[PDB]
Structures are given as structure tokens and as C-alpha cells.
RNA sequence: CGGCACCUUACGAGAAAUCAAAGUCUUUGGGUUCUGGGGGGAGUAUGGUCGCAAGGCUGAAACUUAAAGGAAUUGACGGAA
RNA sequence: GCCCAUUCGGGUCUUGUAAUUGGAAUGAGUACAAUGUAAAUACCUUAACGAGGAACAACUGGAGGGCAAGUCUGGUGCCAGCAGCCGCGGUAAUUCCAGCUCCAGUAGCGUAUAUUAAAGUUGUUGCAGUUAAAAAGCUCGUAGUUGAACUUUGGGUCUGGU
């Protein structure tokens, strides 16, 4: 068996073409090419996005572990799209409140779900210009209302 | 193998098969030393003197081994009429 | 509490086989374990991992423990021993014994130029077990044991000081990987070089020579 | 617009974090040659690593032929000057295996302690930090100085400051003042 | 000499069933075409094109999910023997 | 470590712990000066003051595995939460929330997204296609890619080097 690919000394262009063709099966590559992040993906293919807290929503978790996961329905400012952001640590949701500006981040999985929280893709990071972790700690205090 | 100026490094310097040349490994459990006693005139097999042959294991497994041995013997001068050059 | 079966064992006891080198040369089997110990006092025995392992039964399951052990020194000898028993310590012991029985030499060669003492492999050698191919490429000096942790450990045990690897297929089948590595190591002595073109004498074995001392009375 | 001032993120982390044995070894090394962090060790490794790479490259060409002959030789000379290489070993293939320990041993860290002066590694380091020790007659206060061997005999206590014995130094002065008052 | 075909060892292979090719591959390169890149969403949406149609060829993404598979081992089981 | 170990013990020699205490520096701070400088700052240089746990105070993350390090104590009791993944939670939590310990890195360390490595999981080097995804149902066939062996081999005679 010569094994598929042409092993000729002048078979280079063909090989290149083949490689290119193959490239469209690789998912990451495809994404990079087509601008799926730029055309979809609530964020603009960005790390973060500021968004308005439309409402506090407890979401029921996937399976095995059973609980309500204190998420927030956020409306992204730049695009106008509506997403659901999980809110970390104990309480935290109280701190976040309602109708606040909220700086979101990706959850970890380059999109996709994060473990058990179904239909949820984002960590709330900052609420109206602080930081959720900090608030939880009480190392830093909130700037009043 | 030979460091600096001789000083033979690497022990266990292996038995190489008589038929194949093929190195006989440390755990070549199949490979064999045949000892053929040295002949003398009118009976007599001369105690403590042999033509020693090593056979690798691969050959034995194949069954091409006996023939090889015979050939070797012929080459040496332990046989006549047995192993022909052409078949 | 010694007492040997095996002609070879008897010979060893007597004290006419000096080192394991002779044994290796005459590819003599070592079904008994103590012989190896006698020969080589510097056997470092290191347990690599222990899988729990379960046959399924009409009621419950049969938990046993596949203990993998690597044995060595820094001379150029290694042993790989696998056993699966229910008592863990016992299993480990068994594995160790197996490794000892195996113990196999390694041709340690030169990186490039002779200069000092050799502590890499001679040739690009590779092994295989299931879907693990461990390929050991000889390193330069000081460049270390570039390998998967288990593999590295094995190399250390052997007395290979510097080496490159390329472990491919499912390396996380740890035992399998180890086996592959062992195979590769073995293949070192077996790969013919131009150093060994020259013809050897074929020495008589200890089993032939010291035949009266071996065997029972 | 002048020109980019160049730098190197010189001193590089290992590829796994928690190889336990490795960590232990590092710790031991630190203990031996009183380092503040693993960072120093990493730096040392990088330094040595580069050298090793260079050696390898040289080998990959024919010794007798030119670049290999010359550049390699130069490197060897440099190493000798530094005092990591021995005088028995000047054959390039010896550099190939230098080891980090050796490198550590050449520091003004240890070349204080090795020559007495301090008493106990850490103490020496402290002394170096606190504006004592002049390798020439110019006050080194970097622990990771790397002594030149050619200027290792010249390592003294500082011309100025105590221990060298120019001025007694602050606490002593205070004590004297107190005595006077009394 | 030719196509529609068993046994052992495999040193050759192979994840193994097995394979005299599914061998001469980490000791990696005889010459070529074509196809595949976790599972689903989906042979769908869309556009093309081909058709009398039914359908065909061509062929997505969003979104979703930690398994989907393969081979076998021991079990358990079977209105199998 | 031990001169000796009829029991001790001196402790002749070397190390670690105590809000003991004591002498010796220190520059981080400040500050005449002088340096710098276009003028200044800041640096380097100096006088003078400035360290003893109350400071002249190191944070970040983690402490089941992957993966270095707690089967510690309470608070909780499918909750609230952690958890990249595996997963932990249902009155015995080493995974949640606090103290102590402890680890890792250290004036840095975390998180997010990209991206490179790892990925021989894009493969020319270097993958797979009997069954795991994968051989067009079959043959024909232009481009392309490739394509059997054969023409000057061998010997001498000097002559430069390394
Ligand atoms: Mg559940
Ligand atoms: Mg001063
Ligand atoms: Mg898919
Ligand atoms: Mg902390
Ligand atoms: Mg935590
Ligand atoms: Mg905790
Ligand atoms: Mg651990
Ligand atoms: Mg508890
Ligand atoms: Mg890549
Ligand atoms: Mg693949
Ligand atoms: Mg298929
Ligand atoms: Mg088909
Ligand atoms: Mg079809
Ligand atoms: Mg031709």
C-alpha cells in the first residue's frame, strides 16, 4: 500500500489542496475561519461583556447534584442579546440585586455549559463596578446603592 | 563499546547464531547450543573437545533450523552426502 | 532457608557462576528467584501502580490487585513484574519476584563520541504492547530522561542517565506502557551493530562445564 | 522612536508544576545554597540549558571544522573563567553535563561562605545584601553574582563599613553614646 | 501456469475477533484515487443542481452533550439447544 | 555525637526552641549638602534620624483525586454552596462556610477569552478507512500524479595536499 496521499516529487499542490479540504473537518479551525464568534456567540468573540441585570432567576441543576443555581438573566449592552449568567459563591445574587450593570465573563469551556448548570455560559464578575469575589470576602466594600 | 582507549565497556557480549548471524538475546528461550564431540580414528569421540554451534530461536520456530545445522556441519566437515549446495 | 531446585540454581549456590552476565550469555532460564538476588545485591524495587481489578460474580465481585513493579540498580539491568492477587502486600511481593526473575541487561551506548562512560541507549530502539509503542531515542549528555513518569523511573532503575522517548498510542494503560518500554530495552541487545560484526568463539556454558556440581547426588 | 530596548523573559518555569520528587530536589538545592525562591533555581537551569543547547548544536557539526572549533572553544573558555568548568575538563562534551549545583556553587552567595567570612550561607547572603563584601574594591550586593575564580582570592570584606573595620556601625555608635551619657 | 477456497506458529499484524494478508510501519517513504476527524443536532436548514414525481447528488450552522462507540472478560439473563 | 554506658551524670563537643536579653549593621523611609539637569525631579554619594513583634507587618490562591498539601475541629445536612473534569451535599461532609495548621508561587498570584505546545486529535516528516468515523455499488476516463531495464566501465603512471 502506497497509503492514499501522493508521494510524487511534483505532487505538492494537490497535497496542499487536500490538506486545506481536511482543515474544514477540524472544528476550531472552522470557527476561526467563518467568524462564528464574530457573527454569533453573544459576546463579540471577546473575553468579557458588560450587561444589564434584567432579573434574578434560580435555575434547576442538571442531575446527580440537585439544586437551584441562582443565575441572572442579563442583556448584553453592545449587541443587545439576552443571556443567562451564573453567580458564584454564597449569596452573591443578593449583592448583584436587579437592574444593575454587570460585567460578565465566559464560564470556562470556550462557550458550552459549565458542568451541571443547564443553558448557562457566564460568570458574573463585577456588579456595578466592584467584583463579586471581593464583595463575598468583604476585603473591599460596595459603593453604597 | 570501546571507551577512550580500549577499555571494553558493555559486557554480555552476545552469542551470535551459527546459521543466521542474528544475535541470541539474554531471554531467547528457544535458542540452543548444540555440542558435537570431536571425532578420532576407529571409534573415539575425544572427551572434552567439541564443535559448538549456536542456533537462534527464530530458525527453530520456522523449522528451517535442522537443515541449517546440517549445512553448517557439512561446511565444517562433520558430514558427507547430506546437505547439497543446490536443491 | 535456601535450598535450590534447577541445576543453574545449584551452580549459583556452589559459587561457580560469578555474575548474571554469564547467564545472559548462555540465555539460561531463572525460574528460581534467589539466584538473581545472590548475583545482584543492589536491586531497587519500586512499585509503579496497583489497579484494583474485579471479576463479576452471581453475588458481588472478586477484588484483586494488579500490582506493577519495576526493579533495577544503576548497572544496566531492569526487571518488570506484574502480578494480581487479593492480599496487596503479597501481590506486591509476587510482582517483585517476577521482576527479579525477568531481570534483563541493557546495552548502554554513546550519545556521540566515546569520551566518558556510557549512560544513554546505543541505537534508536522501540517496543510494543497492545496500543503502546514506546520509542527510546538516544540522548546527548546531561539532557536527562525525557519521558513519561513511569518510563523515566524505569530508565533511572536501568541506569540509563540520558534518553529521549516518544510514547505513542494509549500511554495511560500504564502497565502496557511499562511492558512496551521493557521490550524496547530488551531490543537494545539484539540490534546488531558494526561493533559486533566480529566473530565470537562460542564459549562452553557453566551448565555443560560444571555439570557434576549441578544436579542432585 | 529611538529603538526597542530588548529584553528576555529569561528564567523559565518547568513544564509540569507538581512533580513531587523534582520539587523536593529543588527545595534541597535551595537549602544547600540559601535561595529566596525556586525562581533562582529556574534561572540557573535556563542558563545551563542554553549552554547545553549550544553544545548540542556544536556537536551536530564536525569538530575540526570551523564554527564548531571556534565558538565552542570560546564557550569553554568562558565557562572556565566563570569557574564552573574544571581545568581537567575543556572538551565541550564535558560542558554538555555541567549541572545546576555547580553553577550555584560559583555564586558570590557561596564564595563568601566557602571562604569563611560569614558563617552559615544565609548569614553570608544577608551580609552581601547589607552593603558589605567588595569583590574588587567595589561593593557587590547581588547574591547571584557568579564569582570569576580569577577574582575569588580578591573577595574581601568592604573597604568601608564594619567587619573590614573602617567604621563600627550604628548600634555600636548608639551604645558608645549611652556609655558616654552614663 | 490460473479464479469464485484449510492448519500451525507467528518472528510479520492487529485493541481483539482474528489475518498468509488486515504482513514487509516509530527499523516510520513501491505507485495512485478516493474517503474520515467526539457524539448528536443532520443527511436536516438553506441554496445549487438533477428529476414526471417519489427522491437523488451536493451539503451548514446555531445549539447541545461527557461520553457515542468498538472489541472482548466475567457474570446475570433468554417463551435458545 | 558520646570519655565511660557498677543506675545516674558531667554535656568536656555540636544543633534547634523562649513576649528572654545584649551587643554589631541595614535601607525602605526622611533629610542638610554635593551630584544630576536646559531647569528640575529620580538615580548613584553622603551627614543627621531612623526596628524588636504593637512592627519600618506579604499577598494570592489551594489543602479527596487529576496535582504539591488536613480522614483536624464546628457550622451545614440535596441546602448554601465548591467543582475546568472527576465530582462532593441527603445528620459521621478531609470537596461548602470559619480558626489552626499546612501546601504552592512569591511582589507577585488568580480568573476570562484567544492562541502555541501537548495534538501522530490535520499526519510532508507522521494518522486512520474488515468491524471504532472512514473504500465512491461498479467499470470507463481528460487533467493531474507517477512509470521497467540499456549507452564510459574498469586498470596503470606520476603528482599537490591533511
Ligand atoms: Mg443525585
Ligand atoms: Mg554605607
Ligand atoms: Mg461531528
Ligand atoms: Mg491563605
Ligand atoms: Mg477553597
Ligand atoms: Mg477548607
Ligand atoms: Mg496528594
Ligand atoms: Mg466535618
Ligand atoms: Mg494544533
Ligand atoms: Mg486519528
Ligand atoms: Mg465504517
Ligand atoms: Mg460502502
Ligand atoms: Mg451508497
Ligand atoms: Mg528508468
Q: How far is the CA of A3 from the C1' of E71 (A)?
A: 25
Whether A63 sits with its Cβ under 7 A from any strand F atom: the answer reads no
Q: Strand A82-86 vs strand A122-127: parallel, antiparallel, or unpaired?
A: parallel
Whether A115 sits with its Cβ under 7 A from any strand F atom: the answer reads yes
D24 touches chain C (CB under 8 A): no
What is the extent of the structural domain holding B40? 1-87
CB-closest option in B2, B28, B50 to C114 = B2
Identify the closest residue of chain C to B6 by CA–CA distance. Answer: C114
Q: What residues contact D162, with CB distance under 8 A and at least 6 apart?
A: D132, D168, D169, D172
Cell 526493579: give the residue.
C71
Identify the closest residue of chain C to D15 by CA–CA distance. Answer: C146
For residue A30, the surrounding DSSP H or E stretch is helix A27-34
Of the ligands numbered here, which is closest to the C-alpha atom of A32?
Answer: 9
Angle between helices D20-32 and D38-60 (to 10 degrees): 100
Interface mutation target, options C189, C194, C209, chain B, most CBs of B under 10 Å: C189
D52 touches chain C (CB under 8 A): yes
C chain contacts of residue B52, beta-carbon cutoff 8 Å: 202, 204
Looking at C135-206, which runs of residues are DSSP E strands? 135-138, 145-146, 163-165, 168-169
Residue D87, number of CB atoms within 10 A of its CB:
6
**SS3 of residue D55 by DSSP:** helix
What is the C-alpha separation between C95 and C45, in angstroms, rounded? Answer: 10
The architecture (CATH level 2) of C1-105 comes to 2-Layer Sandwich (3.30)
CB-closest option in D59, D94, D99 to C140 = D59
Domain count, chain B: 1
Identical fold for domains C1-105 and C106-199, yes or no, is no
What is the C-alpha separation between D92 and C63, in angstroms, rounded? Answer: 56
What is the C-alpha separation between A52 and A72, in angstroms, rounded? Answer: 10
Whether D16 sits with its Cβ under 7 A from any strand F atom: the answer reads yes
Tell how far the Cα of D57 is from the centroid of ligand 5, in angstroms: 47
Q: Strand A122-127 vs strand B32-37: parallel, antiparallel, or unpaired?
A: unpaired
Cell of C16: 561457580
Nearest to C95 by CA among C23, C181, C22, C175: C175
**CATH number of B33's domain:** 3.30.1230.20
The per-type count for chain D, helices as H runs and strands as E runs, is 7, 0
Domain edges within chain C: 1-105, 106-199
Tell how far the Cα of C54 is from the centroid of ligand 13, in angstroms: 44
Nearest to D143 by CA among D40, D3, D46, D13: D40
DSSP C59: S
What is the C-alpha separation between C157 and C176, in angstroms, rounded? Answer: 18
Q: Is A64 annotated as a binding residue?
A: yes
Q: Do D55 and C140 touch (CB under 8 A)?
A: yes
Q: Do B15 and C114 touch (CB under 8 A)?
A: no
Q: How far is the CA of C180 from the C1' of E26 (A)?
A: 13
Write the DSSP string, B41-66: SSS---TT-EEEEEE-HHHHHHT-HH
Q: What residues contact C109, with CB distance under 8 A and at least 6 apart?
A: B1, B10, C118, C120, C121, C122, C123, C138
Q: What residues contact D40, with CB distance under 8 A and at least 6 apart?
A: D30, D144
Residues ending a continuous segment of chain A before a break (C–N > 2.5 Å): none
What is the C-alpha separation between C9 and B73, in angstroms, rounded? Answer: 33
Interface mutation target, options D58, D62, D96, D98, chain C, most CBs of C under 10 Å: D96
Q: Do C202 and B33 touch (CB under 8 A)?
A: yes
Burial-class residue C72 by CB neighbours within 10 Å (0-12, 13-18, 19+): buried
Tell how far the Cα of D32 is from the centroid of ligand 3, in angstroms: 55
What is the C-alpha separation between B41 and A48, in angstroms, rounded? Answer: 101
The architecture (CATH level 2) of C106-199 comes to 2-Layer Sandwich (3.30)
For residue B4, the surrounding DSSP H or E stretch is none
Bases on strand E under 7 Å from any protein CB? 9-11, 14-16, 23-38, 60-66, 73-76
What is the C-alpha separation between A82 and B52, in angstroms, rounded? Answer: 88
C117 touches chain D (CB under 8 A): no
What is the C-alpha separation between B23 and B17, in angstroms, rounded? Answer: 6
Q: Strand F: which residues 94-113 of A lie within 7 A (CB)?
A: 105-111, 113
Q: Do B53 and C202 touch (CB under 8 A)?
A: yes
Which chains are within 8 Å of C by 3+ CB pairs?
B, D
Method: cryo-EM
Identify the closest residue of chain C to D57 by CA–CA distance. Answer: C140
What is the C-alpha separation between D147 and D142, in angstroms, rounded? Answer: 11
Q: What residues contact B51, with CB distance under 8 A and at least 6 apart?
A: B35, B36, B38, B76, B78
Nearest to A73 by CA among A95, A46, A98: A98
Counting every residue written for chain A, the total comes to 145
Tell how far the Cα of A67 is from the centroid of ligand 8, in angstroms: 21
C chain contacts of residue B53, beta-carbon cutoff 8 Å: 202
From residue C41, how far is each of C17, C36, C107, C158, D13 by CA, in Å?
Answer: 15, 8, 20, 15, 39
Cell 569553554: give the residue.
D76
Q: Do C143 and D52 touch (CB under 8 A)?
A: yes
Amino acid at each position: 500500500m502506497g497509503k492514499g496521499k501522493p508521494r510524487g516529487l511534483n505532487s505538492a499542490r494537490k497535497l496542499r489542496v487536500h490538506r486545506r479540504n481536511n482543515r474544514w473537518a477540524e472544528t476550531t479551525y472552522k470557527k476561526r475561519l467563518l467568524g462564528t464568534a464574530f457573527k454569533s456567540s453573544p459576546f463579540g468573540g471577546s473575553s468579557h461583556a458588560k450587561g444589564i441585570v434584567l432579573e434574578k432567576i434560580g435555575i434547576e441543576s442538571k442531575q446527580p447534584n440537585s439544586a437551584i443555581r441562582k443565575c441572572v438573566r442579563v442583556q448584553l449592552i453592545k449587541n443587545g442579546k439576552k443571556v443567562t449568567a451564573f453567580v458564584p459563591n454564597d449569596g452573591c445574587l443578593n449583592f448583584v440585586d436587579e437592574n444593575d450593570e454587570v460585567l460578565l465573563a465566559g464560564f470556562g469551556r470556550k462557550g458550552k455549559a459549565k458542568g451541571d448548570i443547564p443553558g448557562v455560559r457566564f460568570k458574573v464578575v463585577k456588579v456595578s463596578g466592584v467584583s463579586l469575589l471581593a464583595l463575598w470576602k468583604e476585603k473591599k466594600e460596595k459603593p453604597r446603592s | 563499546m570501546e571507551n577512550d582507549k580500549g577499555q571494553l565497556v558493555e559486557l554480555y557480549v552476545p552469542r551470535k547464531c551459527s546459521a543466521t548471524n542474528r544475535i541470541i538475546k539474554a531471554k531467547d528461550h528457544s535458542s540452543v547450543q548444540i555440542n558435537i564431540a570431536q571425532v578420532d580414528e576407529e571409534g573415539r569421540a575425544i572427551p572434552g573437545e567439541y564443535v559448538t554451534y549456536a542456533l537462534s530461536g527464530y530458525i527453530r520456530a520456522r523449522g528451517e533450523a535442522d537443515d541449517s545445522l546440517n549445512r553448517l556441519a557439512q561446511q565444517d566437515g562433520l558430514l558427507k552426502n547430506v546437505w547439497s549446495y543446490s536443491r | 532457608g535456601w535450598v535450590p531446585v534447577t541445576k543453574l540454581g545449584r551452580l549459583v549456590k556452589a559459587g561457580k557462576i560469578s555474575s548474571i552476565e554469564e547467564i545472559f550469555l548462555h540465555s539460561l532460564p531463572v525460574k528460581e528467584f534467589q539466584i538473581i538476588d545472590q548475583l545482584l545485591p543492589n536491586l531497587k524495587d519500586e512499585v509503579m501502580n496497583i489497579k484494583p481489578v474485579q471479576k463479576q460474580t452471581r453475588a458481588g465481585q472478586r477484588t484483586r490487585f494488579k500490582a506493577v513493579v519495576v526493579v533495577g540498580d544503576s548497572n544496566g539491568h531492569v526487571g518488570l513484574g506484574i502480578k494480581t492477587a487479593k492480599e496487596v502486600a503479597g501481590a506486591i511481593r509476587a510482582g517483585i519476584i517476577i521482576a527479579k526473575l525477568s531481570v534483563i541487561p541493557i546495552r548502554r551506548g554513546y550519545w556521540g563520541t566515546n569520551l566518558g562512560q556510557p549512560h544513554s541507549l546505543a541505537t534508536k530502539t522501540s517496543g510494543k504492547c497492545g496500543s503502546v509503542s514506546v520509542r527510546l531515542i538516544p540522548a546527548p549528555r546531561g539532557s536527562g530522561i525525557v519521558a513519561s513518569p513511569a518510563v523515566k523511573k524505569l530508565m533511572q532503575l536501568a541506569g540509563v542517565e540520558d534518553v529521549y522517548t516518544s510514547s505513542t498510542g494509549s500511554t495511560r494503560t500504564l502497565e502496557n506502557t511499562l511492558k512496551a518500554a521493557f521490550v524496547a530495552i530488551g531490543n537494545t541487545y539484539g540490534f546488531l551493530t558494526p561493533n559486533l560484526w566480529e566473530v565470537q568463539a562460542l564459549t562452553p556454558s557453566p551448565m555443560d562445564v560444571y555439570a557434576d556440581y549441578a544436579t542432585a547426588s | 522612536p529611538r529603538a526597542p530596548r530588548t529584553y528576555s523573559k529569561t528564567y523559565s518555569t518547568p513544564k509540569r508544576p507538581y512533580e513531587s520528587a523534582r520539587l523536593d530536589a529543588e527545595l534541597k538545592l535551595a537549602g544547600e545554597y540559601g535561595l529566596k525562591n525556586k525562581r533562582e533555581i529556574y534561572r540557573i537551569s535556563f542558563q545551563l540549558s542554553k549552554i547545553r543547547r549550544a553544545a548540542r548544536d556544536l556537536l551536530t557539526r564536525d569538530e575540526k571544522d570551523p564554527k564548531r572549533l571556534f565558538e565552542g572553544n570560546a564557550l569553554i573558555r568562558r565557562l572556565v573563567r566563570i569557574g564552573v568548568l574544571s581545568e581537567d575538563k575543556k572538551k565541550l562534551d564535558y560542558v554538555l553535563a555541567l549541572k545546576v549545583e555547580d553553577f550555584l556553587e560559583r555564586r558570590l552567595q557561596t564564595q563568601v561562605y566557602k571562604l569563611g567570612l560569614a558563617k552559615s550561607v544565609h548569614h553570608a547572603r544577608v551580609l552581601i545584601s547589607q552593603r558589605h563584601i567588595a569583590v574588587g574594591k567595589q561593593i557587590v550586593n547581588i547574591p547571584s553574582f557568579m564569582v570569576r575564580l580569577e577574582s575569588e582570592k580578591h573577595i574581601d570584606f568592604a573597604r568601608t563599613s564594619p567587619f573590614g573595620g573602617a567604621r563600627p556601625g550604628r548600634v555600636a555608635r548608639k551604645r558608645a553614646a549611652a556609655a558616654g551619657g552614663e
